[PDB]
A paper describes a structure:
The [name] homology 3 ([name]) domain is a ∼60-residue modular domain that consists of two antiparallel β-sheets orthogonally packed to form a single hydrophobic core. This domain is present in many proteins and regulates critical cellular pathways by recognizing polyproline-rich motifs (PRMs; Kurochkina & Guha, 2013). Three-dimensional domain swapping (3D-DS) is a mechanism by which some proteins can oligomerize by exchanging identical domains or structural elements between monomers. In previous work, the 3D-DS of the c-[name] [name] domain has been characterized and its dependence on experimental conditions has been described.
Crystallographic structures of the intertwined dimers of the [name]_Abl-2 and [name]_Abl-RT chimeras were obtained. Interestingly, both domain-swapped structures differ from those previously obtained for the WT c-[name] [name] domain. Indeed, the open interface of the [name]_Abl-RT and [name]_Abl-2 chimeras differs from that present in WT c-[name] [name]. As in the WT protein, in the [name]_Abl-RT intertwined dimer the n-[name] loop is the only hinge loop, although the open protomer shows a different conformation. In the WT protein, a salt bridge between Arg95 and Glu115 stabilizes the dimer. This salt bridge is not present in the [name]_Abl-RT (Arg95Ser) and [name]_Abl-2 (Arg95Ser and Glu115His) chimeras, where these residues are replaced. The analysis of the open interface of the [name]_Abl-RT dimer shows hydrogen bonds that differ from those found in the dimers of the [name]_Abl-2 and WT protein. In this dimer, the n-[name] loop adopts an extended β-strand-like conformation that facilitates the interaction between residues of different chains in the open interface: the Asn113A side chain interacts with the backbone atoms of Val111B and Asn112B and the side chain of Asn113B (and vice versa). As shown in Fig. 8(a), the two chimeras that form an intertwined dimer exhibit the highest B factor in the distal loop.
Numbering used by the authors:
A (entry chain A), B (entry chain B): 81 to 140
The structure:
Amino acid sequence: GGVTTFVALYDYVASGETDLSFKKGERLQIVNNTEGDWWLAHSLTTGQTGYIPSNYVAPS
Amino acid sequence: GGVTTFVALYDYVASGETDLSFKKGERLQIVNNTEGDWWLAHSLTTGQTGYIPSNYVAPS
């Protein structure tokens, strides 16, 4: 059965606003683009990232 | 060429820690699983989400 969790091998310090910092030994999930009808999105105004309902958006 | 940016149609208030809040009219990117060797991850310890170098992790 597929793995549920990954562990960090090293410390990582983020340089941008889309990447994630973490400490060696930290426990992390690798996540999917989509969760049902929810898509992963990155807010250009608040710089944060997360899933959103795909029916709440339209192309520019 | 493909769309670069989406616009919010309504306000959304997040309920969990994997979902993203945004206001109507916010400009958002829908993001890809991977960017090169980098995968999207969700930190169970800090609750934050972001890209990480895939060579910095191992399965549990």
